């Protein structure tokens, strides 16, 4: 039972998994090392002994000690790397691959040993492709190493019974199928895994986003005032605004009915919004809306803020930022939100979600349930992967980031919203998180030291070792309190941390022994906290010399660990996540418009709706309310002067060509003449071997006659 939950779930089905011999273990190590070597792309031998040794250590940690990959990479990194710089470094991806290959290796050998114990369309063809979709694209396994998804496209087409693929076997000059569908399944598995890697990595980059900071000079928790444009109809649809304190608790919602664009009395909106800021006194403003009207609204907010000279005590203007709202869009329909707030309109819930996302994107993403996160638009071809691979990719992504930044147990015991991410901590899962929280609730007191987790038998040795490094207790303010408890230092190396601090403090060699016999190591870290010259004294210590002396005498290898010790001895829990990611440019237009680059891109022929006319220019409307600016010299109007009304009329649908797109300012230049509107925007490869010229030319007769068919 003292096994990580994820490993228990993976190893649930296999039998006699732990019964491996010496020859089986060497086979395993040499083979799996070769598998990763394929991706590492070594040259010659490159003293592969050290590499295969690193894999030996890794598989020992996984299979024998039952350590999760985040723990190994955090506190056992040096055992999984070349002793010399830039040699080799097995990334989280490599470790996840190792565990995945390990389970399948054991299963495969259990089977091997148990023995001793070209597109072809169908009748439905030419009907789903219509020669005008992204499916318009001698295939061989070498090609699939680069564009793996193409094979998924064909497999999916086969699943819906459109086209079937017969393995490439023209060299021929029941049996062949019997032998080749095995290779077909191996190719499907390989390509599925390869796409699972990219989807995981892109979800990872979304998770790696630190909290927004209003002041780079003196960053503190920001007072946030969210507001949304609404459906975009100004002069009505009163602008919603919400206020949330630094603690992240909703305080009060607002609703501004005064129109920012009422040119008659614009002072009205400016006055009420000024009162809103005077009341809440926020430090940042968040905005996101359903349609391009949000751009005009944002511009108005910026100019209004500049006009009222609204600045924080720093003297700089309060920043306004566009924040992603996908999770907010799901939140407004989420049952949890309804149960959270009794009487709030959808826009209020949405604005609150925007604020929370601005505080912690990690918690927001973690709070999503299985089906909403699964349906979350993460990768264009995410639907190709089956539920199990996609779910594993997501779980591994959550595990990495959630372990990158520790979890405060004191907050988690009651802040359910903040505690819901605990199930993803190393050595924890669905079943374990509930039991852990229940036990802490039964405690009725805040944990004073990490050791209390084991003394009260809250955890078990293996699980504690797997997780005790990430869980932490914030420092405040008796003797029970320890500074190390407010640092992501594993309990095992607390003695090491005290020893390095002692060396950095230059104690008399005899007093170290005297303090050890007296059991007074903690006073060293206390004295280091008290003295003022922490910098000049600490960084002067050379990590390499100490790590070498440690490994030479004790035999351990903890250079990376010692580095984390000295690094965090300065300031506790320095933020490691990268800076925030405000929506800038293209992503703004994409999010606020919802028009794909496959439809609305530079030089695209798209139908436009004429709505308004101007002195000499003409105005455009698109399927998602996009304005276009067409000068009279693009419809043959200005060549001889005079207004353009003589040519076109309001209300009819007209084809048009885009010439310039300003994603940042949501404006585009278009031409409406047949000279430009009358033409191959998309076309895949056409080499005679790569592409079937015969089918393309022969099909033209059927395509022409079908109208008359």
From Swiss-Prot:
Compartments reported by the entry: Nucleus; Chromosome
Signal peptide: none
Family, similarity comment: Belongs to the SPT6 family.
Biological role: Histone H3-H4 chaperone that plays a role in maintenance of chromatin structure during RNA polymerase II transcription elongation thereby repressing transcription initiation from cryptic promoters. Mediates the reassembly of nucleosomes onto the promoters of at least a selected set of genes during repression; the nucleosome reassembly is essential for transcriptional repression. Essential for viability.
Additional record remark: Present with 8890 molecules/cell in log phase SD medium.
Subunit annotation: Interacts with CTR9.
Full protein name: Transcription elongation factor SPT6
Biological source species: Saccharomyces cerevisiae (strain ATCC 204508 / S288c) (Baker's yeast)
Name of the encoding gene: SPT6
Residues included from the entire protein: 320 to 1243 of 1451
């Amino acid at each position: 039972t003292d096994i990580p939950e994820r490993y228990q779930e993976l190893r649930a089905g296999i039998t006699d998994y732990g019964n491996m011999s010496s020859e089986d273990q060497e086979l395993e190590r040499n083979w799996i090392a070769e598998k990763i070597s394929v991706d590492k792309n070594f040259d010659a031998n490159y003293d592969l002994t050290e590499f295969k040794e690193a894999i030996g250590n890794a598989i020992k940690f996984i299979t024998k000690e039952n350590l999760e990959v985040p723990f190994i990479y955090a506190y056992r990194r040096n055992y999984i790397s070349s002793r010399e710089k830039d040699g080799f470094l097995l990334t989280e991806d490599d470790l996840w691959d190792i565990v995945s290959l390990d389970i399948e290796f054991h299963s495969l050998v259990n089977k091997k040993d148990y023995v001793q114990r070209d597109v072809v369309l169908t009748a439905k063809g030419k009907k789903e492709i219509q020669k005008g979709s992204l499916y318009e694209d001698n295939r061989t396994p070498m090609h699939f190493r680069r564009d793996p998804d193409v094979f998924l496209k064909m497999v999916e087409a086969e699943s819906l019974n459109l086209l079937s693929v017969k393995l490439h076997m023209s060299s021929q000059a029941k049996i062949f199928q019997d032998i080749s569908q095995e290779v077909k399944d191996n190719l499907t598995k390989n390509c599925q895994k390869l796409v699972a890697k990219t989807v995981r990595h892109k979800f990872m980059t979304k998770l790696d986003q630190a909290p927004f900071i209003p002041n780079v000079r003196d960053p503190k928790i920001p007072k946030i005032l969210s507001l949304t444009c609404g459906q975009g109809r100004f002069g009505a649809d009163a602008i919603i605004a919400v206020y949330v304190n630094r603690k992240g608790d909703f305080i009060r919602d607002y609703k501004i009915v005064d129109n920012p664009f009422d040119k008659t009395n614009p002072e009205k909106f400016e006055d009420t919004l000024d009162n809103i800021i005077q009341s809440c006194q926020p430090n940042a403003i968040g905005i996101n809306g359903p349609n391009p009207k949000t751009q005009k609204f944002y511009k108005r907010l910026q100019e209004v803020l500049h006009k009222k000279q609204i600045v924080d005590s720093r003297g700089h203007t309060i920043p306004i930022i566009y924040v992603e709202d996908e999770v907010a869009i799901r939140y407004q329909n989420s049952e949890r939100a309804a149960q959270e707030f009794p009487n709030k309109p959808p826009l209020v819930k949405y604005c609150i979600a925007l604020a929370r996302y601005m505080h912690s994107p990690l918690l927001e993403y973690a709070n999503l349930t299985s089906e909403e996160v699964r349906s979350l638009s993460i990768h264009p071809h995410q639907n190709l992967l089956s539920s199990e691979q996609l779910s594993w990719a997501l779980e591994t992504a959550f595990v990495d980031i959630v372990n990158l930044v520790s979890v405060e147990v004191n907050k988690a015991t009651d802040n359910n919203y903040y505690a819901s991410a605990l199930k993803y901590i190393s050595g924890f899962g669905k079943r374990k998180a509930i039991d852990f929280l229940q036990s802490l609730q039964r405690l009725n007191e805040p944990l004073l030291a990490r050791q209390q987790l084991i003394t009260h038998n809250i955890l078990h040795k293996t699980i504690f070792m797997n997780s005790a490094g990430f869980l932490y207790i914030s420092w405040n303010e008796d003797l029970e309190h320890d500074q190390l408890d407010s640092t992501r230092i594993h309990p095992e190396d607390y003695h090491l941390a005290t020893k390095v601090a002692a060396d950095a403090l230059e104690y008399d060699p005899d007093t170290i022994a005297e303090k050890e016999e007296q059991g007074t190591m903690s006073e060293f870290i206390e004295l280091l906290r008290e003295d003022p010259d922490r910098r000049a004294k600490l960084e002067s210590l050379n990590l390499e010399s100490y790590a070498e002396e440690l490994e030479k005498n004790t035999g351990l290898r903890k250079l990376n660990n010692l580095n984390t010790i000295v690094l965090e001895l300065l300031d506790g829990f320095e933020e490691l996540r990268n800076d925030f990611h405000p929506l800038q440019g293209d992503e703004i237009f994409q999010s606020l418009t919802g028009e794909s680059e496959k439809t609305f891109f530079k030089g695209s022929i798209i139908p436009v709706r004429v709505e308004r006319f101007w002195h000499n220019d003409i105005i455009c409307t698109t399927n998602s309310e996009v304005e276009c600016v067409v000068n009279a010299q693009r419809h043959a109007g200005a060549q001889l002067r005079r207004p353009a009304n003589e040519i076109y009329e309001i209300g009819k649908t007209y084809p048009a060509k885009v010439i310039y797109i300003d994603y940042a300012n949501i404006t585009a230049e278009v031409s409406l003449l047949d000279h430009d509107v009358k033409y191959v925007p998309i076309s895949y490869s056409k080499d005679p071997s790569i592409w079937d010229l015969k089918q393309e030319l022969e099909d033209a007769e059927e395509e022409r006659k079908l109208m008359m068919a």
